[PDB]
């Protein structure tokens, strides 16, 4: 039974490793999501996961896939440590307050509490990362930043510290949607599998249900995710509000534009969760018995 320090460090390392491994998927998702917002005179058009990744690699370099990676890693540290700490102090509290089972509702409550605090803590990282991922020299929009820390310094000096928390409420709404949809869909699909006994309750049912629940969460949070990416990436004054950005997306690009980057998003989610789970378990066991 690992100590708190082992949990914190293993969560940080596993989350950071999954982040560096699956970061090109996130960059592809951001590129697909900001595509269509502004017309481009270049022939470069992003379509698909491999298509977007290869287009970015061949027109901007391999290093452009990891644009904003230090921001992503800082978030991962904050989110992983905060997840462990608040998981303890909130879920133990929920189970011990009335002495009941770890229901679904308690999992929603703890997940939203932890995710809200994590979103607020890591919003500046996420703003910097989205802006660095979205910026390009090919589509007529001048890049604002040279790198992560340049982006921090410029945004803080020319937009205020509040400017580092732009898009906090879309991020929060998306985190709520992902958490609730994953939990509900996973439980429903598993107990649908079992209420029939369609598949064996070993790992494969869990894998299938987590796959389906992750896709369902990605699809449910995709409109919020596209609007969040476009709003956060936007310079001050372009969008009066977040619903203003959503309404412009709807009127000028329609409903399918709310699902841009859906395949990269789902692949990013699934692969990141798998990598972090395996790495986190291995690190916990190793530091528990090194």
């Amino acid at each position, epitope marked *: 039974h690992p100590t708190l320090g082992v949990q914190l460090f293993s969560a940080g390392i596993a989350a950071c490793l999954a982040d560096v491994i699956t970061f090109p998927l996130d960059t592809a998702k951001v590129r697909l999501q900001v595509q269509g917002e*502004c017309p481009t*005179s270049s022939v470069i058009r992003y379509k698909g996961v491999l298509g977007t990744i290869t287009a970015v690699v061949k027109t901007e370099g391999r290093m452009k896939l990891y644009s904003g990676l230090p921001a992503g890693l800082q978030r991962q540290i904050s989110s992983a440590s905060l997840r462990i700490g608040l998981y303890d102090t909130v879920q133990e509290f929920l189970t011990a307050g009335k002495e009941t089972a770890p229901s679904l509702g308690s999992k929603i409550l703890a997940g939203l509490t932890t995710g809200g605090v994590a979103v607020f803590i890591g919003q500046p990282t996420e703003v910097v990362k989205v802006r660095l991922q979205a910026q390009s020299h090919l589509h*007529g929009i001048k890049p604002r930043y040279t790198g992560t820390y340049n982006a921090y310094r410029i945004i803080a000096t020319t937009e205020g510290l509040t400017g580092l928390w732009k898009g906090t409420t879309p991020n929060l709404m998306r985190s709520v949607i992902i958490n609730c949809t994953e939990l509900v869909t996973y439980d429903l699909m598993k107990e649908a599998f079992v209420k029939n006994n369609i598949l064996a309750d070993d790992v494969p049912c869990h894998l299938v249900s987590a796959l389906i629940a992750g896709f369902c969460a990605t699809a449910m949070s995709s409109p919020v995710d596209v609007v969040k990416t476009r709003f956060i990436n936007s310079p001050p004054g*372009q969008y009066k509000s977040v619903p203003n950005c959503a309404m412009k997306v709807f*009127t000028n*690009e*329609g409903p399918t534009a709310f699902f841009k980057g859906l395949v990269p998003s789902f692949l990013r989610l699934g692969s990141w969760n798998v990598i972090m789970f395996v790495c986190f378990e291995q690190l916990k066991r190793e530091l528990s018995k090194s």
Partner: nanobody
Amino acid sequence: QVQLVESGGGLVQAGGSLRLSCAASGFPVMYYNMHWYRQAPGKEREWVAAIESTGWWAHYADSVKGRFTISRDNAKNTVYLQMNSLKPEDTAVYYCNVKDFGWRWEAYDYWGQGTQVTVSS
């Protein structure tokens, strides 16, 4: 009931200037990108310019860039095409355009009646 009304076209010498207006009515212009097209007889309708919902970006056809500018006043529901150094090749009917995408498979095009611009030589 979308209505786009173009005005400001006329007959001008080559190298002259002309400011076209599009009065837009029956929709919330603040959410819609606006476009200027042109069609001359014996040619297809050519996209000229596009402006963002609030004027954040503006893009042009290569044949009109630097000569034509596109502008908005969402308060007056008006879109403007300033046309400078006009050449006889710019003689066409100029059309204001709104692509309403909304709850559709592809965008629906709304057009004005067009204003004729003739450049003399």
